[PDB]
Design a protein around this ligand. Structure first.
Ligand code: ADP
Ligand code: ADP
Ligand code: ADP
Ligand code: BEF
Ligand code: BEF
Ligand code: MG
Ligand code: MG
Lengths: 419, 419
RNA sequence: CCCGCUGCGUGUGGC
């Protein structure tokens, strides 16, 4: 029992609940009004009411608990938190809070809360002395996020090729670059499925920025976890603040020694939104990029790291290259200077239609020896040496038609060694 | 005992110290409060507290001894030095001062220095009669900094190739120019190891401006010297302040006839920070560079020189090219006009996964006859004549698989002359 | 030969 359940419950159920116990209503107004009336009558009955939300701090000192359904923006229902509670519990923006709430008093249009009992999914006083995110000691990615599933399915081929080309570890700063219609979004979907299957302990938060609504619905339907989105019909500031809220929530989760994974549908459009919202400095680089536009995107992308104290933040963002515009090229080569994993998809392999359309020679990760073991690293070395002389197309066809009949990558390696 | 000595000890040790013979405390507050309390009680005994720092002189006349843990920035404990002491000892910004401090009394908000005992690791009676940095007569580099080792290991190979392409001397202005992912940071790490092993007498300082925090941790746990860092999380103003503090410290050390070596993880990011901080003048160069933006980067880079009076300052920095934005192109081609040593790494050799990915033909140093012997220069000329016709990837493969079987460069030259 | 001390425009986006 909490505010969220009543928010997501069907209108018929809540109208019946108000009808039998409570004053009758014919439901001539909005559902939120009926929810407010039900909350009022339940508070009058004397029963405590629960509430949940992700905290966002305002410049005055008070904060609002935004809801995930509204994609963490302001809305009609936003629990108010006083600066006194924030100071007492040392809360920061992005800290999810669950606790007892109260209906608004006179002159108040938002619910308030009197007690908290779940701060970032644990007992609240643990927030008294936790090490801050910027105070953690970062490290190179040590643990490996194996995307391989071993079921032998056709979609498992993309995960296997991902494992072979550019290994992904915990705390990786990854980029997936390709021209449009080259297989980016479906690669992200396959990555999300592999994460959900292999690594259920990780907190997967798929963030879509400046993307088509149909893809938003597809992600919400076929992804197990949390999906937040901001379609392309929304302003740039919308995308900007959604991204800030998501990254702050991820940082707060990491502060509690959690493994957090974020999949970004496109970092190029996030950089474009940041450029649009940035004040003009009078200096413009190649393309339309403002000189000071890329600081905040750099911070957002570089929030991903491997923490020695425990937990990690992985970010896998897609990007556009070879689109005929220097904006995308400069964005890619500027985020190439801060990322770790790089995966290239080429339109030539996509037109030839052999999927996944991965450019093996142009894709790799930094410090692969820290993820793969010695024998696996040597096998990867041999495979890359064999693949490199061949072109992209024939190498991809040879690899795909060479590991398809093999269930596991280890068996593929040993069969390469045998033959 | 020093103040920094109490900083470096764990909180448990200092709280036990404060509990066994000092006032009892259960440590409910921050560490700095305990440090202040124990220092005040120790001064109340009638003895003398000690401390140390690096001097930064404010525009009003007084100064503060910043600490390395705060990246030589304003922290919550900075020993105050009166203008009288500065005038007495002719102290300038960046001087490392160690001496007797006193606790803050009423009206005093930070610690204060009353007696000094060491200025730049020397008695304070030598700083009054020294020659300022700007008055030292500059000179071309004469003493060679041998990066070679007798190990024969693979990691030595890179250093060896450096000794063949661009010899490095004391007082050089180095530029490791390459696109992203070419190998600049690993090459800088190898240079740091070579400096630490071959030349332990040189003062090695590593400056990382706007780079990955994991690389900062790797430098800290790998470099045998001093590491000062400012990751991309910080703004450009912090970057420039840290840069000026480091360069002032290096200049003060050079004024005492010391060999100082500075390694810059990226001079391009420093130039970008200076461009963002500089006031607009209405004139913008191609690529988005302000017209008056590169003067201070020029001063920072040209602070490196060989001093005839004794000592030297050697700055080796990494730069960026082929990013797709002409900002980096103009920055590199402008720093090439104020440097001595250029070492180029090509992205395509890196994609071949052949390391080091040095561009031998585009790499060289100015006035190499002053750093090498006659026979060594003759052999280097012969090798360059051999290498020049062949392609860059072929050249690097030939060089690597030719000097892999020789422990030193002399054996490589002997086997090339013989065969 | 006697002297008063010291926004937009342009540029940058731009080939
Ligand atoms: N593994 C795959 N199998 C079949 N088609 C694919 C695959 N990956 C991508 N595609 C094709 O890509 C097109 C859409 O591009 P998508 O993969 O969603 O990334 P993006 O839209 O970002 O380019 C679809 O028409 C789909 O047919
Ligand atoms: N001497 C070397 N030996 C082996 N690998 C190297 C060497 N130098 C660079 N690399 C490779 O380069 C990657 C790191 O590149 P880095 O130097 O960080 O790029 P940048 O020069 O743009 O900072 C690592 O994954 C590493 O495998
Ligand atoms: N006539 C020459 N003989 C030998 N070396 C030369 C000659 N002219 C230039 N160099 C080489 O060029 C380098 C200096 O170039 P410099 O003339 O300073 O460049 P800039 O033209 O930018 O001033 C020296 O290291 C030297 O080896
Ligand atoms: F067409 Be997709 F955006 F590569
Ligand atoms: F990718 Be490197 F930092 F240029
Ligand atoms: Mg897409
Ligand atoms: Mg680097």
């Amino acid at each position: 029992m909490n505010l969220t359940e009543l928010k997501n419950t069907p209108v018929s159920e809540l109208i019946t609940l108000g009808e039998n116990m409570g004053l009758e209503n014919l439901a001539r107004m909005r559902k939120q009004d009926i929810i407010f009336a039900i909350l009022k009558q339940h508070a009058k009955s004397g029963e405590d009411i629960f509430g949940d939300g992700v905290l966002e701090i305002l410049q005055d000192g008070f904060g609002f608990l935004r809801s995930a359904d509204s994609s963490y923006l302001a809305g009609p229902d936003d629990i108010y938190v006083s600066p006194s509670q924030i100071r007492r519990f040392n809360l920061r923006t992005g800290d999810t809070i669950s606790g007892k709430i109260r209906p608004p008093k006179e002159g108040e249009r938002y619910f308030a809360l009197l007690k908290v009992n779940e701060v970032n999914f644990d007992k609240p006083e643990n927030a008294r002395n936790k090490i801050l995110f910027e105070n953690l000691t970062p490290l190179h990615a040590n643990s490996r996020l194996r995307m391989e599933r071993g079921n032998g399915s056709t979609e498992d081929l993309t995960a296997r090729v991902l494992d072979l080309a550019s290994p992904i570890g915990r705390g990786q700063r990854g980029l997936i670059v390709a021209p449009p219609k080259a297989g980016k979004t479906m690669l992200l979907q396959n990555i999300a499925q592999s994460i959900a299957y292999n690594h259920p302990d990780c907190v997967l938060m798929v963030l879509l920025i400046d993307e088509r609504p149909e893809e938003v619905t597809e992600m919400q339907r076929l992804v197990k976890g949390e999906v937040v989105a901001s379609t392309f019909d929304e302003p740039a500031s919308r995308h900007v603040q959604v991204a800030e809220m998501v990254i702050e929530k991820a940082k707060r989760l990491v502060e509690h020694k959690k493994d957090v994974i974020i999949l970004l549908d496109s970092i190029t459009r996030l950089a474009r939104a940041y450029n649009t919202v940035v004040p003009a400095s009078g200096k413009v680089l190649t393309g339309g990029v403002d000189a000071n536009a890329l600081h905040r995107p750099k911070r957002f992308f570089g929030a991903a790291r491997n923490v020695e104290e425990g937990g990690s933040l992985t970010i896998i963002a897609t990007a556009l290259i070879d689109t005929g515009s220097k904006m995308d090229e400069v964005i890619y080569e500027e985020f190439k200077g801060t990322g770790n994993m790089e995966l290239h998809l080429s339109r030539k392999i996509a037109e030839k239609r052999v999927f996944p359309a991965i450019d093996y020679n142009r894709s790799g990760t930094r410090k692969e020896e820290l993820l793969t073991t010695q024998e696996e690293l040597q096998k990867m070395w041999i495979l890359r040496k064999i693949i490199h002389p061949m072109g992209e197309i024939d190498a991809m066809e040879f690899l795909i038609n060479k590991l398809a009949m093999t269930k596991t990558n280890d068996d593929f390696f040993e069969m390469m060694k045998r033959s």
